[PDB]
Design a protein around this nucleic acid. Sequence first.
DNA 1: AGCACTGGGTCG
DNA 2: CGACCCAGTGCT
Length: 166
Amino acid sequence: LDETERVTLIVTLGHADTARIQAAPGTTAGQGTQYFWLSKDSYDFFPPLTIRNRRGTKATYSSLINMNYIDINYTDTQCRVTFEAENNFDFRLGTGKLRYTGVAKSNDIAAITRVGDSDYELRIIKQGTPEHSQLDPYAVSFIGNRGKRFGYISNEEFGRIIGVTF
DNA sequence: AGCACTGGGTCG
DNA sequence: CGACCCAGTGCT
């Protein structure tokens, strides 16, 4: 991992991003697969999307990564990031371990730090926190029609803002 | 049980 | 019709 690529993806979370995280067990709201929807341009932040869809007629190009859910102390070696190429151009980051946990809601900030070629750490930056205030401006790029914002920050400065050594 | 799939929505 | 948004179904 080149020094230039040791960065953190900051993205403002929406409703669909946290619908299953906030939902109660057995609710329709808490049904389905839990993702964070990212920008399609962020694929260069991830390993080569080479893993193909087994079933299905439409093409999906996926990659498996080690995601370190920091807020729940869990490293999922099977965190799938998928580009729905022939469907709706969704770029999804699997976050199923946060289901029914309620650690994130709308306008919270997801911080995805790249610490290796295939190694990542996921932190939820709750709204109302100084960290959220200092991280929010780094999300300059507007995506979606619901006002999602994303951007990148050096692991250094992010580490300073949240008080963590990388 | 829970995620790989499905397939609409909406805005420009 | 490109690019996120959203709510599931059904297969493993």
